[PDB]
PDB file of C-alpha atoms and ligand atoms in Angstrom:
ATOM      1  CA  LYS M   1     -20.585 -13.987   9.800  1.00 19.31           C
ATOM      2  CA  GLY M   2     -16.965 -13.855  10.978  1.00 18.16           C
ATOM      3  CA  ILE M   3     -14.060 -15.632  12.684  1.00 15.67           C
ATOM      4  CA  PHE M   4     -13.384 -16.934  16.204  1.00 16.46           C
ATOM      5  CA  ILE M   5     -10.013 -16.064  17.759  1.00 18.08           C
ATOM      6  CA  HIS M   6      -9.405 -18.826  20.323  1.00 16.71           C
ATOM      7  CA  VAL M   7      -8.769 -16.719  23.436  1.00 17.57           C
ATOM      8  CA  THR M   8      -9.154 -18.062  26.998  1.00 20.91           C
ATOM      9  CA  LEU M   9     -12.346 -17.598  29.009  1.00 20.90           C
ATOM     10  CA  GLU M  10     -10.634 -15.037  31.262  1.00 20.92           C
ATOM     11  CA  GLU M  11      -9.271 -13.104  28.259  1.00 17.80           C
ATOM     12  CA  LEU M  12     -12.737 -13.253  26.632  1.00 18.19           C
ATOM     13  CA  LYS M  13     -14.520 -11.573  29.577  1.00 17.57           C
ATOM     14  CA  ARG M  14     -11.504  -9.247  29.862  1.00 15.91           C
ATOM     15  CA  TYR M  15     -11.984  -8.442  26.165  1.00 17.04           C
ATOM     16  CA  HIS M  16     -15.668  -7.513  26.531  1.00 12.63           C
ATOM     17  CA  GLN M  17     -14.801  -5.159  29.419  1.00 10.67           C
ATOM     18  CA  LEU M  18     -12.809  -3.027  26.961  1.00 13.39           C
ATOM     19  CA  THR M  19     -14.438   0.053  25.453  1.00 12.31           C
ATOM     20  CA  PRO M  20     -15.995  -0.233  21.968  1.00 11.12           C
ATOM     21  CA  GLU M  21     -13.133   2.010  20.808  1.00 14.97           C
ATOM     22  CA  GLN M  22     -10.483  -0.389  22.133  1.00 16.07           C
ATOM     23  CA  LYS M  23     -12.528  -3.291  20.737  1.00 16.07           C
ATOM     24  CA  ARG M  24     -12.834  -1.946  17.164  1.00 14.10           C
ATOM     25  CA  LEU M  25      -9.119  -1.052  17.256  1.00 12.71           C
ATOM     26  CA  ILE M  26      -8.372  -4.707  18.076  1.00 13.48           C
ATOM     27  CA  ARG M  27     -10.442  -6.154  15.215  1.00 15.92           C
ATOM     28  CA  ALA M  28      -9.148  -3.412  12.888  1.00 12.11           C
ATOM     29  CA  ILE M  29      -5.626  -4.646  13.729  1.00 15.14           C
ATOM     30  CA  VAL M  30      -6.467  -8.303  12.976  1.00 17.33           C
ATOM     31  CA  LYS M  31      -8.050  -7.217   9.667  1.00 21.07           C
ATOM     32  CA  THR M  32      -4.865  -5.336   8.714  1.00 23.18           C
ATOM     33  CA  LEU M  33      -2.979  -8.559   9.467  1.00 22.39           C
ATOM     34  CA  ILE M  34      -5.388 -10.728   7.425  1.00 22.61           C
ATOM     35  CA  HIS M  35      -4.854  -8.437   4.411  1.00 22.72           C
ATOM     36  CA  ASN M  36      -1.117  -8.114   5.067  1.00 23.09           C
ATOM     37  CA  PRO M  37      -0.006 -11.457   6.602  1.00 22.18           C
ATOM     38  CA  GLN M  38       3.623 -10.600   5.808  1.00 25.02           C
ATOM     39  CA  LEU M  39       3.219  -8.047   8.636  1.00 22.99           C
ATOM     40  CA  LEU M  40       2.481 -10.770  11.248  1.00 23.68           C
ATOM     41  CA  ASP M  41       6.061 -11.811  12.151  1.00 23.86           C
ATOM     42  CA  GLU M  42       7.187  -8.253  12.887  1.00 22.69           C
ATOM     43  CA  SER M  43       4.121  -6.754  14.594  1.00 20.16           C
ATOM     44  CA  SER M  44       4.057  -9.833  16.857  1.00 20.80           C
ATOM     45  CA  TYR M  45       7.636  -8.915  17.790  1.00 18.36           C
ATOM     46  CA  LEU M  46       7.014  -5.195  18.392  1.00 19.74           C
ATOM     47  CA  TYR M  47       3.780  -5.778  20.338  1.00 21.41           C
ATOM     48  CA  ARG M  48       5.759  -8.172  22.562  1.00 21.56           C
ATOM     49  CA  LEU M  49       8.710  -5.747  22.806  1.00 26.15           C
ATOM     50  CA  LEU M  50       6.448  -2.905  23.962  1.00 23.91           C
ATOM     51  CA  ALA M  51       4.684  -5.384  26.272  1.00 21.66           C
ATOM     52  CA  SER M  52       7.987  -6.364  27.926  1.00 20.78           C
ATOM     53  CA  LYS M  53       9.103  -2.715  27.904  1.00 23.13           C
ATOM     54  CA  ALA M  54       6.106  -1.904  30.137  1.00 22.98           C
ATOM     55  CA  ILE M  55       7.334  -4.453  32.713  1.00 26.71           C
ATOM     56  CA  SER M  56      10.947  -3.218  32.636  1.00 27.23           C
ATOM     57  CA  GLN M  57      13.211  -0.915  30.618  1.00 28.68           C
ATOM     58  CA  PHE M  58      15.768  -3.736  30.395  1.00 27.94           C
ATOM     59  CA  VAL M  59      14.585  -6.113  27.655  1.00 30.35           C
ATOM     60  CA  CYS M  60      16.435  -8.682  25.519  1.00 33.20           C
ATOM     61  CA  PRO M  61      16.084  -7.920  21.778  1.00 29.39           C
ATOM     62  CA  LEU M  62      16.294 -11.614  20.807  1.00 31.04           C
ATOM     63  CA  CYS M  63      14.017 -13.287  23.343  1.00 29.67           C
ATOM     64  CA  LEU M  64      12.103 -10.179  24.504  1.00 29.01           C
ATOM     65  CA  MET M  65      12.216 -10.980  28.223  1.00 24.94           C
ATOM     66  CA  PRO M  66      12.359  -8.221  30.857  1.00 27.23           C
ATOM     67  CA  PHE M  67      15.144  -8.076  33.453  1.00 28.75           C
ATOM     68  CA  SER M  68      15.402  -6.286  36.800  1.00 27.65           C
ATOM     69  CA  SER M  69      18.585  -4.394  35.953  1.00 27.96           C
ATOM     70  CA  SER M  70      21.011  -3.684  33.120  1.00 31.32           C
ATOM     71  CA  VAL M  71      23.489  -5.870  35.046  1.00 31.60           C
ATOM     72  CA  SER M  72      21.170  -8.910  34.809  1.00 33.18           C
ATOM     73  CA  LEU M  73      20.329  -8.193  31.143  1.00 33.21           C
ATOM     74  CA  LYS M  74      24.089  -8.135  30.509  1.00 30.70           C
ATOM     75  CA  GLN M  75      24.535 -11.429  32.356  1.00 27.44           C
ATOM     76  CA  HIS M  76      21.708 -13.064  30.336  1.00 23.74           C
ATOM     77  CA  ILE M  77      23.202 -11.829  27.061  1.00 27.92           C
ATOM     78  CA  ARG M  78      26.649 -13.010  28.206  1.00 27.34           C
ATOM     79  CA  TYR M  79      25.728 -16.628  29.121  1.00 27.25           C
ATOM     80  CA  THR M  80      22.017 -17.352  28.546  1.00 27.21           C
ATOM     81  CA  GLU M  81      21.070 -16.001  25.078  1.00 27.44           C
ATOM     82  CA  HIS M  82      21.802 -18.478  22.252  1.00 23.20           C
ATOM     83  CA  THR M  83      19.255 -17.395  19.620  1.00 25.20           C
ATOM     84  CA  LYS M  84      20.965 -17.547  16.208  1.00 25.85           C
ATOM     85  CA  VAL M  85      17.922 -16.255  14.305  1.00 25.51           C
ATOM     86  CA  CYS M  86      16.617 -12.678  14.256  1.00 27.04           C
ATOM     87  CA  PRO M  87      13.048 -12.861  15.561  1.00 26.04           C
ATOM     88  CA  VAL M  88      11.800 -10.088  13.246  1.00 29.12           C
ATOM     89  CA  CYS M  89      13.333 -11.050   9.881  1.00 32.01           C
ATOM     90  CA  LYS M  90      14.487 -14.668  10.547  1.00 32.52           C
ATOM     91  CA  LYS M  91      17.926 -14.126   9.023  1.00 31.78           C
ATOM     92  CA  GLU M  92      20.263 -16.786  10.376  1.00 31.93           C
ATOM     93  CA  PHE M  93      23.690 -16.214  11.852  1.00 29.61           C
ATOM     94  CA  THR M  94      26.906 -17.865  12.971  1.00 30.29           C
ATOM     95  CA  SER M  95      26.799 -16.015  16.314  1.00 30.77           C
ATOM     96  CA  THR M  96      24.233 -14.602  18.770  1.00 29.22           C
ATOM     97  CA  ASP M  97      26.355 -11.425  19.009  1.00 32.33           C
ATOM     98  CA  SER M  98      26.005 -11.023  15.229  1.00 33.79           C
ATOM     99  CA  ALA M  99      22.250 -11.544  15.663  1.00 30.59           C
ATOM    100  CA  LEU M 100      22.248  -8.859  18.387  1.00 31.33           C
ATOM    101  CA  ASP M 101      24.182  -6.512  16.089  1.00 31.93           C
ATOM    102  CA  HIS M 102      21.767  -7.139  13.184  1.00 31.58           C
ATOM    103  CA  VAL M 103      18.614  -6.527  15.267  1.00 30.27           C
ATOM    104  CA  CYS M 104      20.048  -3.170  16.407  1.00 30.00           C
ATOM    105  CA  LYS M 105      21.413  -2.088  13.010  1.00 25.70           C
ATOM    106  CA  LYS M 106      18.609  -3.261  10.709  1.00 30.77           C
ATOM    107  CA  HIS M 107      15.611  -3.180  13.023  1.00 32.21           C
ATOM    108  CA  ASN M 108      16.410  -0.357  15.518  1.00 36.45           C
ATOM    109  CA  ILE M 109      16.263  -2.570  18.635  1.00 35.00           C
ATOM    110  CA  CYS M 110      19.390  -1.880  20.674  1.00 34.13           C
ATOM    111  CA  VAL M 111      20.327  -2.563  24.306  1.00 36.61           C
TER     112      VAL M 111
ATOM    113  CA  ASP W   1     -32.965 -17.856  12.937  1.00 38.48           C
ATOM    114  CA  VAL W   2     -31.389 -14.928  14.803  1.00 40.04           C
ATOM    115  CA  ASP W   3     -31.060 -13.919  18.476  1.00 42.76           C
ATOM    116  CA  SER W   4     -29.145 -10.623  18.658  1.00 42.44           C
ATOM    117  CA  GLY W   5     -29.585 -10.067  22.421  1.00 41.21           C
ATOM    118  CA  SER W   6     -28.164 -13.495  23.291  1.00 40.14           C
ATOM    119  CA  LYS W   7     -25.465 -13.303  25.989  1.00 41.52           C
ATOM    120  CA  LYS W   8     -23.576 -16.570  25.305  1.00 43.49           C
ATOM    121  CA  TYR W   9     -21.067 -14.611  23.185  1.00 42.28           C
ATOM    122  CA  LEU W  10     -19.626 -13.738  26.629  1.00 45.38           C
ATOM    123  CA  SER W  11     -18.892 -17.387  27.542  1.00 41.50           C
ATOM    124  CA  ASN W  12     -18.165 -19.022  24.160  1.00 42.69           C
ATOM    125  CA  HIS W  13     -15.252 -21.491  24.243  1.00 41.69           C
ATOM    126  CA  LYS W  14     -14.194 -20.708  20.656  1.00 45.21           C
ATOM    127  CA  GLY W  15     -13.532 -17.221  22.061  1.00 45.78           C
ATOM    128  CA  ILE W  16     -13.745 -13.751  20.512  1.00 46.16           C
ATOM    129  CA  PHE W  17     -16.095 -13.492  17.517  1.00 47.60           C
ATOM    130  CA  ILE W  18     -14.681 -10.906  15.104  1.00 47.52           C
ATOM    131  CA  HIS W  19     -17.254 -10.160  12.392  1.00 53.38           C
ATOM    132  CA  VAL W  20     -15.678 -10.122   8.945  1.00 51.94           C
ATOM    133  CA  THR W  21     -16.571  -9.833   5.228  1.00 52.68           C
ATOM    134  CA  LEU W  22     -16.542 -12.702   2.682  1.00 51.58           C
ATOM    135  CA  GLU W  23     -13.148 -11.862   1.114  1.00 49.47           C
ATOM    136  CA  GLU W  24     -11.134 -11.797   4.355  1.00 53.09           C
ATOM    137  CA  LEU W  25     -13.130 -14.652   5.977  1.00 52.97           C
ATOM    138  CA  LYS W  26     -11.869 -17.010   3.267  1.00 53.29           C
ATOM    139  CA  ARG W  27      -8.462 -15.289   3.316  1.00 54.16           C
ATOM    140  CA  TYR W  28      -8.282 -15.969   7.081  1.00 58.18           C
ATOM    141  CA  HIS W  29      -8.901 -19.719   6.649  1.00 59.33           C
ATOM    142  CA  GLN W  30      -6.231 -19.555   3.917  1.00 59.02           C
ATOM    143  CA  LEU W  31      -3.591 -18.614   6.516  1.00 61.22           C
ATOM    144  CA  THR W  32      -1.193 -21.271   7.811  1.00 59.47           C
ATOM    145  CA  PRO W  33      -1.734 -22.629  11.356  1.00 61.42           C
ATOM    146  CA  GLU W  34       1.406 -20.665  12.316  1.00 61.68           C
ATOM    147  CA  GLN W  35      -0.063 -17.363  11.032  1.00 62.79           C
ATOM    148  CA  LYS W  36      -3.353 -17.897  12.897  1.00 62.72           C
ATOM    149  CA  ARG W  37      -1.296 -18.568  16.046  1.00 65.00           C
ATOM    150  CA  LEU W  38       0.523 -15.222  15.685  1.00 64.19           C
ATOM    151  CA  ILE W  39      -2.789 -13.369  15.206  1.00 64.41           C
ATOM    152  CA  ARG W  40      -4.072 -14.912  18.448  1.00 63.97           C
ATOM    153  CA  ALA W  41      -0.813 -14.102  20.283  1.00 66.06           C
ATOM    154  CA  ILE W  42      -1.067 -10.432  19.248  1.00 69.93           C
ATOM    155  CA  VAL W  43      -4.738 -10.252  20.267  1.00 68.79           C
ATOM    156  CA  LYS W  44      -3.849 -11.843  23.628  1.00 73.71           C
ATOM    157  CA  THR W  45      -1.061  -9.277  24.144  1.00 72.86           C
ATOM    158  CA  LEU W  46      -3.438  -6.444  23.186  1.00 72.86           C
ATOM    159  CA  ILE W  47      -6.010  -7.772  25.687  1.00 72.37           C
ATOM    160  CA  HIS W  48      -3.447  -7.796  28.542  1.00 75.57           C
ATOM    161  CA  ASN W  49      -1.790  -4.457  27.626  1.00 78.66           C
ATOM    162  CA  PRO W  50      -4.588  -2.228  26.221  1.00 80.69           C
ATOM    163  CA  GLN W  51      -2.350   0.894  25.966  1.00 78.50           C
ATOM    164  CA  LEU W  52      -0.657  -0.840  23.007  1.00 78.85           C
ATOM    165  CA  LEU W  53      -3.914  -0.085  21.132  1.00 78.35           C
ATOM    166  CA  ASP W  54      -3.169   3.658  21.466  1.00 78.26           C
ATOM    167  CA  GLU W  55       0.395   3.005  20.214  1.00 75.95           C
ATOM    168  CA  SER W  56      -0.767   0.866  17.253  1.00 74.08           C
ATOM    169  CA  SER W  57      -1.074   3.668  14.677  1.00 76.37           C
ATOM    170  CA  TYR W  58       2.613   4.402  15.334  1.00 76.31           C
ATOM    171  CA  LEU W  59       3.662   0.738  15.124  1.00 75.68           C
ATOM    172  CA  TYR W  60       2.034   0.114  11.719  1.00 80.91           C
ATOM    173  CA  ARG W  61       3.320   3.450  10.395  1.00 80.94           C
ATOM    174  CA  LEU W  62       6.798   2.415  11.612  1.00 80.21           C
ATOM    175  CA  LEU W  63       6.526  -0.918   9.775  1.00 79.60           C
ATOM    176  CA  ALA W  64       5.168   0.737   6.611  1.00 82.87           C
ATOM    177  CA  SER W  65       8.124   3.161   6.611  1.00 84.54           C
ATOM    178  CA  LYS W  66      10.651   0.414   7.405  1.00 86.01           C
ATOM    179  CA  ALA W  67       9.428  -1.422   4.279  1.00 86.59           C
ATOM    180  CA  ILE W  68      10.200   1.648   2.137  1.00 86.48           C
ATOM    181  CA  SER W  69      13.621   2.068   3.767  1.00 88.43           C
ATOM    182  CA  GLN W  70      15.968   0.753   6.453  1.00 89.18           C
ATOM    183  CA  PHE W  71      16.660   4.385   7.413  1.00 89.31           C
ATOM    184  CA  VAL W  72      13.672   5.801   9.301  1.00 89.49           C
ATOM    185  CA  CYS W  73      13.294   8.577  11.872  1.00 88.25           C
ATOM    186  CA  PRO W  74      11.656   7.453  15.142  1.00 88.54           C
ATOM    187  CA  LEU W  75      10.045  10.856  15.777  1.00 88.02           C
ATOM    188  CA  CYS W  76       8.425  11.388  12.342  1.00 87.01           C
ATOM    189  CA  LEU W  77       8.542   7.829  10.885  1.00 87.62           C
ATOM    190  CA  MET W  78       9.671   9.113   7.461  1.00 86.16           C
ATOM    191  CA  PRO W  79      12.056   6.987   5.337  1.00 85.88           C
ATOM    192  CA  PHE W  80      15.323   8.373   3.981  1.00 86.37           C
ATOM    193  CA  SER W  81      17.576   7.285   1.123  1.00 85.09           C
ATOM    194  CA  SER W  82      20.618   6.650   3.330  1.00 84.87           C
ATOM    195  CA  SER W  83      21.927   6.906   6.897  1.00 83.77           C
ATOM    196  CA  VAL W  84      23.739  10.128   5.924  1.00 81.54           C
ATOM    197  CA  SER W  85      20.505  11.828   4.799  1.00 80.42           C
ATOM    198  CA  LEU W  86      18.660  10.401   7.830  1.00 77.92           C
ATOM    199  CA  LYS W  87      21.007  12.041  10.359  1.00 79.92           C
ATOM    200  CA  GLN W  88      21.134  15.260   8.334  1.00 80.22           C
ATOM    201  CA  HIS W  89      17.379  15.310   8.994  1.00 83.09           C
ATOM    202  CA  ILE W  90      17.742  14.454  12.679  1.00 85.86           C
ATOM    203  CA  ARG W  91      20.557  16.965  13.209  1.00 89.17           C
ATOM    204  CA  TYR W  92      19.044  19.910  11.289  1.00 93.73           C
ATOM    205  CA  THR W  93      15.377  19.216  10.409  1.00 90.43           C
ATOM    206  CA  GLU W  94      13.678  17.173  13.187  1.00 92.86           C
ATOM    207  CA  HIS W  95      12.128  19.570  15.751  1.00 95.21           C
ATOM    208  CA  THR W  96       9.395  17.536  17.521  1.00 95.98           C
ATOM    209  CA  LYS W  97       9.477  17.575  21.341  1.00 99.51           C
ATOM    210  CA  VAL W  98       6.668  15.022  21.786  1.00100.02           C
ATOM    211  CA  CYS W  99       7.246  11.269  21.701  1.00100.10           C
ATOM    212  CA  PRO W 100       5.072   9.798  18.886  1.00101.12           C
ATOM    213  CA  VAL W 101       4.384   6.770  21.107  1.00100.95           C
ATOM    214  CA  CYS W 102       3.629   7.934  24.683  1.00 98.80           C
ATOM    215  CA  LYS W 103       3.037  11.686  24.144  1.00 95.35           C
ATOM    216  CA  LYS W 104       5.500  12.811  26.817  1.00 93.47           C
ATOM    217  CA  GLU W 105       7.147  16.222  26.266  1.00 96.66           C
ATOM    218  CA  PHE W 106      10.766  17.445  26.417  1.00 95.31           C
ATOM    219  CA  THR W 107      13.174  20.401  26.338  1.00 95.06           C
ATOM    220  CA  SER W 108      15.055  19.242  23.243  1.00 92.81           C
ATOM    221  CA  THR W 109      14.237  16.837  20.402  1.00 94.44           C
ATOM    222  CA  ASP W 110      17.452  15.006  21.382  1.00 97.74           C
ATOM    223  CA  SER W 111      15.828  14.318  24.780  1.00 97.03           C
ATOM    224  CA  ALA W 112      12.796  13.091  22.817  1.00 99.11           C
ATOM    225  CA  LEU W 113      15.154  10.793  20.858  1.00 99.27           C
ATOM    226  CA  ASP W 114      16.858   9.294  23.930  1.00 97.91           C
ATOM    227  CA  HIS W 115      13.407   8.704  25.433  1.00 96.22           C
ATOM    228  CA  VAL W 116      12.025   6.842  22.394  1.00 93.56           C
ATOM    229  CA  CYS W 117      15.140   4.629  22.508  1.00 92.62           C
ATOM    230  CA  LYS W 118      15.343   4.132  26.294  1.00 93.33           C
ATOM    231  CA  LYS W 119      11.653   3.543  27.079  1.00 91.24           C
ATOM    232  CA  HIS W 120      10.280   2.377  23.692  1.00 90.64           C
ATOM    233  CA  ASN W 121      13.424   0.708  22.371  1.00 91.82           C
ATOM    234  CA  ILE W 122      13.370   2.325  18.942  1.00 92.41           C
ATOM    235  CA  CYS W 123      16.887   3.556  18.367  1.00 91.60           C
ATOM    236  CA  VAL W 124      19.014   5.128  15.622  1.00 92.04           C
ATOM    237  CA  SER W 125      22.647   6.181  15.162  1.00 94.15           C
TER     238      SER W 125
HETATM  239 ZN1   ZN D 201      17.312 -13.093  25.519  1.00 90.68          ZN
HETATM  240 ZN1   ZN D 202      16.196  -9.421  11.355  1.00 91.67          ZN
HETATM  241 ZN1   ZN D 203      11.874  12.860  11.950  1.00 89.27          ZN
HETATM  242 ZN1   ZN D 204       7.248   7.979  24.707  1.00 89.22          ZN
END
């Protein structure tokens, strides 16, 4: 007896091509999260940060999207990032720059 | 009635069957729809980037330390009372040359620091 995690058919056959070791690590991680659901918001963030970090070095701390260059990351932060809520802790702000500052200072995610 | 060697687990539409005990089974269907969504999103990310499984021990030790204190060292993941005591540790006491995440090696622990910030995005003053 157990639970079904509603993954797509591709991801399901992809899943079963992983090694038992990778597979028990995965279900060990979901068990940690079931026991500690307060952990979900933040591990979701970090797993997505590290995911984006694999695509490019230049990642946005608020939206977690990879960019080609530091110039384009700067241009996105300058005109295209309007998140007023820190994705890890959900603290709300008056400014996206303040949100950027908070994520760096409190959470260690800096550009 | 059981059928252990059945191969329809491979093509089930409900998806990945994670076997679980009675306590956490009920505790799973006690989660909000939003929490269940996050669990799926993480599992999907882990499926598409399986090297994050090898970095997971670090991630959950980071989070555990961050709960004890805001001031944590990226190389050893140990909490400190203040920022002043944290950078006393980094300046004088932290000697690891290996990145706790990717296992790449360096000349100085300061090069190890810059690396963990530049390519893993975990940064400290
Ligand atoms: Zn962004
Ligand atoms: Zn926050
Ligand atoms: Zn340390
Ligand atoms: Zn590394």
